[PDB]
Amino acid sequence: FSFKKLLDQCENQELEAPGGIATPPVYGQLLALYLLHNDMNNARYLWKRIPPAIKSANSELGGIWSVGQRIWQRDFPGIYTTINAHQWSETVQPIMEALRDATRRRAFALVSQAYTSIIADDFAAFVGLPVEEAVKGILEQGWQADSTTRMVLPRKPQQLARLTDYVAFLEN
Amino acid sequence: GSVSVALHPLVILNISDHWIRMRSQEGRPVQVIGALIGKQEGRNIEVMNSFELLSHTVEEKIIIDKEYYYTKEEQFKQVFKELEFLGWYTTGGPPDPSDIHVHKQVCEIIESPLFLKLNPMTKHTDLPVSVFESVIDIINGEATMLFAELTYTLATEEAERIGVDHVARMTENSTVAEHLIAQHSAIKMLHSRVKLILEYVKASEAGEVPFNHEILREAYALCHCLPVLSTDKFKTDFYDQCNDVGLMAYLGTITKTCNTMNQFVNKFNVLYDRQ
Amino acid sequence: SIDEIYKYDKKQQQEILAAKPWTKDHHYFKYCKISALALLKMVMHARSGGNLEVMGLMLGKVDGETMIIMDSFALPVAYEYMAAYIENAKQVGRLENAIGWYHSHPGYGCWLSGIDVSTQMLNQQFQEPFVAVVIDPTRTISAGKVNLGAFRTYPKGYKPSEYQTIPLNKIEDFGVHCKQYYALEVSYFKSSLDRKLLELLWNKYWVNTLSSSSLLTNADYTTGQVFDLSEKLEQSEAQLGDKLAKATRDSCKTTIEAIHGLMSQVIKDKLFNQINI
Amino acid sequence: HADLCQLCLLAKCFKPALPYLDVDMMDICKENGAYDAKHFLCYYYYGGMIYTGLKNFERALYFYEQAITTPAMAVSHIMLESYKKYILVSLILLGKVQQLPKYTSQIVGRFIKPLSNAYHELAQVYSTNNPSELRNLVNKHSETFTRDNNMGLVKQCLSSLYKKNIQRLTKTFLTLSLQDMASRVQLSGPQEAEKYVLHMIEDGEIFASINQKDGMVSFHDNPEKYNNPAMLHNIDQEMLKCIELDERLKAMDQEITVNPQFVQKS
Amino acid sequence: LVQCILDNTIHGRIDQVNQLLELDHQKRGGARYTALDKWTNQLNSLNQAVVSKLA
Amino acid sequence: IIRGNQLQEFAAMLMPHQKATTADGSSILDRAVIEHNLLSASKLYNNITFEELGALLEIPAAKAEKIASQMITEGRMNGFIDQIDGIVHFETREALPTWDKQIQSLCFQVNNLLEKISQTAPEWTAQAMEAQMA
Amino acid sequence: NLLEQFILLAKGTSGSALTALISQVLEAPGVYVFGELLELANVQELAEGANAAYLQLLNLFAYGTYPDYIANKESLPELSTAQQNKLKHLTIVSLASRMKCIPYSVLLKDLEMRNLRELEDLIIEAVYTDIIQGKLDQRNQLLEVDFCIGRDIRKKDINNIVKTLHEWCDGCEAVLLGIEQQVLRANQYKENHNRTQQQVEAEVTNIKKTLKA
Amino acid sequence: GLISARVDSHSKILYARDVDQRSTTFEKSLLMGKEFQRRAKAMMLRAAVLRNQIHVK
Ligand SMILES: [Zn+2]
């Protein structure tokens, strides 16, 4: 629930500024929050909104955009690869951990809905877990796995007041 | 049934219309006399459509003008093959000696006459109780027969039910209110019945009334039957019906909006662009 | 106290009959006020013949543009029996005279047949105030609502849709004899006072109301209403490029009936299903 | 409103302008006669481009249509560019260029349309459902599209043609091999077809599943049974919109009836 | 069976892969939706006429 | 449903020509009683399989289906047969119409229980409802 | 009810003579509610002595079901074939009160039946006795119960009768209160709309008065 | 539209397609309502530009 206010407070801080340019630390917070909610349209325009002087001075903004670039092309293995490739500051560390976990639920829902049978090697890349781990995870959720083929088979497991409003409108 | 008397709602409306017509014609309310017919099956009454039988009401005495009824007999026999004379009706309160005299006159025609006394001036909730008919009490000397009231039933056919429903409040006061008042009355009487049953159960629990082992068993069965159709198919059908009615409302809110928009553009074309 | 429908005023009736205001304009009569007793007896006689056909006379008076009906008596049937029974109108003590005839169509809609319109033409020609009632027993029994058939016809040699449910057979008779009569708006009047007090016997039922089974009882009626509304709206569109107001009114009434049925169902569900969960 | 949209456009901050673009405008402030058609055209052109950057092509197409339908007798650059972007957006959201309303000024179809010829032939090639021809026209008219600054909208038309072709497969097939599908939509590879189909399922554009055991894609054309209570909620949301629309329509004609200028001429 | 079906004397269809003949004891009174279709089609043309009355 | 334990006596008073066989090993007597059992079982069942229909009417599967389809196409019995799953569907309720009749039965139970209360304690019943509404 | 004549013959008998008559009651067809007989002081006197097990049998046939008999089979006396069928019928009534769609698997568990044919035969003969009305469903393995008789009552579930009836009464009152609110709201909507159209008509005519000066 | 069927190109079976009247009616009615609402809100804006006399010289 706390993620609702954090995104709004960073957006407002960018709107009003003492000199029209916001602080470097709040730029990374806004970019990370956009990626957490899968709002890639505003994140992409935020990258162009960052002045080149700020982007060149702070290398953190370049790194956070690398993670977003993977999400933009829907490169699931690259989302986990770039998240752990670099070390982030403490003010955006907890939300970026939530971004990595949020990507994990996105992969789980995508496989459960868009796949009737997915090979284990590709399925492990989607979730971001090692191949052996992904084998043990599915049975805990009831998903069937078959040996000698290494293939996973996922499957998805005031009316009265309103009505009198309709009549009153029609009868005037 | 214990006395097997079954009145039809058409008779009550007939008597009411007769009384109202005579009251309007003569200015003041006036006593009326009628003739109830019906089907007799040994121990069954089954009153049906009644006719006028004006007769006479002269001064304080009722004269025997039953020759007019005799002429009306063959007339009503042409349209009612299986219907026969059963009794007569009146408008007033408690029975009177004049009613006794008219009943004595009527017993000349038929052996088992009834006596309906529909009261129009009543101001109390339950309906005036139809007929006070008697088996005629005989004592040594003068007969001095009285009337021994026995219960009545309001058995009605489907056509009568539909007609009565149409005359009753059904579809300034809006149609929503008229439709909802009928439901309010039905739910109110159901609630009164259930509340009185609950009061009897509480009285039996406390000890005011003797413990009847069968009434509480029936009450337990009634309580167990209370969740009517709670199936998943019933819910699916109910939601399908609700969605269908919602679509039928959308198609028609759209029509009303189109009509109002047409009126708006008609008024707009004669205000700005004068062509 | 309202009322005032009763108390037959002889002088006014003779004056309006001698004036003959409907001779000048053909569309004089537009409203038909049937009584409670009239409807009760008419529907009872209509259903007391089953699929067979019944017919009788209906008594009433005329006031301005409205025709009020106070009573109705059946007939034995074409032979001498009907003519002998006709004398009932002047034999009893009643000041209402006779205003028209009613006859049932058991399963053939509510329209007027060719022989029916010819008899109505003759009756209007030699008995100036006359109306024809064409109620349907089967439809009111099946759908639970009474359909009215006040269908006064036009004069001979003069030139100037609702219950279109006849599937195949008699629809041909409907088409040819369609412009020869015009419907009358039926507006029921209750005398109030005694009858309004005595209408509590309807409340005695309380079970057919609580379990009405609407929206399926008259599903065919609503489908027919929508089918009529479709070309009513098409005619409104063709004229536009006020029939649109009439189409909107019909849509409003049909939608109101549907929502009333849904409200009854919701009330029943709240009363019975949502208890002891 | 035009200035706010322009500021939100040059700074690429499209979210602050959203509350001022989600409301349908009713009556226009005359500002003592200082309001002209330029302010009307700019609001519905910049606002349409704001929605385009947010991938909201349903309302972006609506905004462009309003600018085109503005009455005019002289050629306007804003109306010209809005016509160019109207074709591209209608080619992305829909499979064809939506027909303009009848009350469009005759100048649009006689001057603006001839000046927009590269976009009209692009629509014609789009109607042939052949991506290779579409890419040839994009390269041929690359200078025209980049000069008009709408580079990327045309590239989105190329990608949307593949989605349109895949959606047509659902109208004919229950199960199609990935290789066979890639040969009909010219994706050149079963791996490419698998990625294209998976993205469509994620976005909800298609109802399908991927079976890697047999290398087949099965189309499950079962959107909704219109039975759940959520459908009832959707119905009353649309019903409330119509009721509010009717209330405004009835109120504004009641202003006409009480107008002293009115009923004098009636 | 094919000749009878083509002659409309047998109301059903043949499932060839299962060697079946499934009859047509279905298609109840769904004419309400057909009536709603005509209502929707008439309304679709009605909006255009009102908006585009004269200009 | 008439079983074989109450039909041996009836065969005693049958006339000799009425005991003739119908070229199937079944006498005339136990041919109209399996048709009667089938029609009567249509009221106690919404759907029955072929195997269980023959486990109740004897004649397990060869002629249990044949008799079921023979009663239909003649108007004697209402239902349809799905031969793939071997189920005879007799008659089903459409949920909503069943809801109305179940409500009516519930209301009838209230009325019947109301009469019982008044019969047992007429004095207690009378004073009850008058003050209840007020 | 057949139990009335049985009560008269047991008004004075006690001990072994009463016990023999009790067995007749439990076997007599058409008797399914042994409540009035149980309240007799002669029957309750059997609690003390060697007939305490026989009293528990009558309590089992009044309030208990077949699974209760299985658990306490050793203590209770032997039951005849007719008595066991009656207990099975009463078990179906108890299940019918809880739910109106009894699964076949549930019924097979309590009634102790090995095959589906025996269970359906028992249900069919239970419908014949008119204690339960319903239809069998082989495809869904359900017993749709439309009506079941009320079993025996005790002085512990009378409060449950009050609680259920009070809930029904409160639900009826809530519906009535809601209907009254909708009636007045609809009336207010109609009168507010009627006032608006009267104001417009008055304004139009007032303008016409000024113009025609 | 001459054949109402779908091709299953795995077992090579042509399956006849049975459309659902209820689902089809609901989706086309909601589509008509959405189009009508868009058209009405567009013309009610046009009434503003016509009343205010907005045009390009
Ligand atoms: Zn006729």
Q: What is the DSSP string of F48-99?
A: EEHHHHHHHSSS-STTHHHHHHHHTTTTSS--EEETTTTEEE-----SHHHH
Domain limits for position C175 = 1-189
Cβ B73 vs Cβ B34: under 8 Å: no
Alpha helices by DSSP H, listed for B80-228, are 97-107, 158-167, 175-206, 215-224
Phi then psi for G132, rounded to 5 degrees? Answer: -130, 140
**What are residue C69's DSSP bridge partners?**
C60
G25 vs B66: CA distance, rounded Å: 64
Chain C hits for G186, Cβ within 8 Å = none
CA nearest to F59, candidates F28, F87, F91, F26 = F26
C117 vs C130: CA distance, rounded Å: 12
Cβ C135 vs Cβ C42: under 8 Å: yes
Q: Find where tokens 């049906």 sit.
A: B48
C252 vs E8: CA distance, rounded Å: 42
Q: Find where tokens 């302010």 sit.
A: D39
Buried b (16+ CB within 10 A) or exposed e, B144-161: ebebebbebeeebeebbb
Q: Does D100 touch chain H (CB under 8 A)?
A: no
3-class SS at B91? strand
**Experimental method for this entry?**
cryo-EM
- CA distances for B273 relative to C16, D219, E54, H56, angstroms: 50, 54, 11, 18
- CA distances for C166 relative to B176, C161, C169, C229, F35, angstroms: 32, 11, 7, 17, 40
For chain C, positions 147-186, list CB contacts with chain B under 8 A. none
Q: Edge-to-edge strands of the sheet including B35-38?
A: B47-51, B35-38, B84-85
Both tokens of residue A168?
């009153």
Q: List CB contacts of C237: < 8 A, sequence separation 6 or more.
A: E42, E45, E46, E49
D83 vs D77: CA distance, rounded Å: 10
CA nearest to E31, candidates C215, F94, C219, B251 = C219
Q: Edge-to-edge strands of the sheet including F80-82?
A: F47-49, F87-89, F80-82
- Would residue G210 be called left, alpha or beta, if left means φ above 0 and alpha means ψ between -120 and 50 degrees? alpha
Cβ–Cβ below 8 Å for A171 and G190: yes
Cβ B218 vs Cβ F116: under 8 Å: yes
**What are residue C181's DSSP bridge partners?**
C153
B99 vs B91: CA distance, rounded Å: 11
Burial class (CB in 10 A: 0-12, 13-18, 19+), B4: middle
Cβ C272 vs Cβ B226: under 8 Å: yes
Cβ–Cβ below 8 Å for A166 and C260: no
CA nearest to D212, candidates D229, D196, D191 = D191
Cβ–Cβ below 8 Å for H29 and B243: no
Cβ C101 vs Cβ C139: under 8 Å: no
G191 vs A172: CA distance, rounded Å: 9
Element (H, E) at B137: none
Phi then psi for D75, rounded to 5 degrees? Answer: -70, 130
Cβ D170 vs Cβ D206: under 8 Å: yes
Cβ–Cβ below 8 Å for B233 and F128: no
Burial class (CB in 10 A: 0-12, 13-18, 19+), F9: exposed
Closest partner CB to B246 (pick from D232, D249, D266): D232
For chain D, positions 16-75, list CB contacts with chain A under 8 A. 16, 53-55
In the reported structure, the alpha carbon of residue D1 is separated from the centroid of ligand 1 by a whole-number distance in angstroms of 69
Both tokens of residue C56?
């009788």
- Would residue D12 be called left, alpha or beta, if left means φ above 0 and alpha means ψ between -120 and 50 degrees? left
Annotated ligand binding at C177? The verdict is: no
Q: List CB contacts of A31: < 8 A, sequence separation 6 or more.
A: A43, A46, A47, A61, A64, A65, A68
The residue type of D115 is L
Determine how many CB atoms are found less than 10 A away from the CB of residue D19.
Answer: 8
Phi then psi for C263, rounded to 5 degrees? Answer: -65, -40
Q: Does G183 touch chain C (CB under 8 A)?
A: no
Cβ C234 vs Cβ B249: under 8 Å: no
- A-D contacts at Cβ under 8 angstroms: 55
For C256, which residue in chain A has the nearest alpha carbon?
A: A167
For B254, which residue in chain A has the nearest alpha carbon?
A: A170
D244 vs D235: CA distance, rounded Å: 14
D181 vs D187: CA distance, rounded Å: 8
F25 vs A85: CA distance, rounded Å: 87
- CA distances for D69 relative to E53, H46, H49, angstroms: 16, 9, 10
CA nearest to D212, candidates C210, E48, A111 = A111
**What are residue E20's DSSP bridge partners?**
E15
Cβ D91 vs Cβ D126: under 8 Å: yes
C–G contact: 3+ Cβ pairs < 8 A: yes
CA nearest to D124, candidates D156, D87, D174, D75 = D87
Both tokens of residue B131?
């007929």
- Kindly provide the resolution of this structure in angstroms, with one decimal: 3.0
B244 vs B241: CA distance, rounded Å: 5
Dihedral of CA atoms A24, A28, A33, A38 in degrees, nearest 10, equals: 130
E24 vs E22: CA distance, rounded Å: 7
Cβ H49 vs Cβ D28: under 8 Å: yes
Cβ B37 vs Cβ B80: under 8 Å: yes
Q: Does G168 touch chain C (CB under 8 A)?
A: yes
CA A149 to the chain's CA centroid: 32
**What are residue A115's DSSP bridge partners?**
D210
A150 vs H54: CA distance, rounded Å: 69
Both tokens of residue G23?
């067995």
Both tokens of residue C189?
């009047």
Closest partner CB to H29 (pick from E17, E30, E40): E40
Burial class (CB in 10 A: 0-12, 13-18, 19+), H41: middle
Q: Which residue spans within chain B are E strands per DSSP?
A: 35-38, 47-51, 84-85, 87-91, 114-118
Cβ C200 vs Cβ F83: under 8 Å: no
- Would residue F7 be called left, alpha or beta, if left means φ above 0 and alpha means ψ between -120 and 50 degrees? alpha
The residue type of C251 is S
Q: Quote the Cα angle for B261-B266-B269, to 5°.
A: 120
C1 vs D216: CA distance, rounded Å: 82
For chain G, positions 120-139, list CB contacts with chain F under 8 A. 120-121, 124, 127, 135-139
CA nearest to E55, candidates B265, F95, A79, D8 = B265
Buried b (16+ CB within 10 A) or exposed e, A124-138: bbbbbbeeeebbebb
Annotated ligand binding at C105? The verdict is: yes
Q: List CB contacts of G117: < 8 A, sequence separation 6 or more.
A: F52, F55, F56
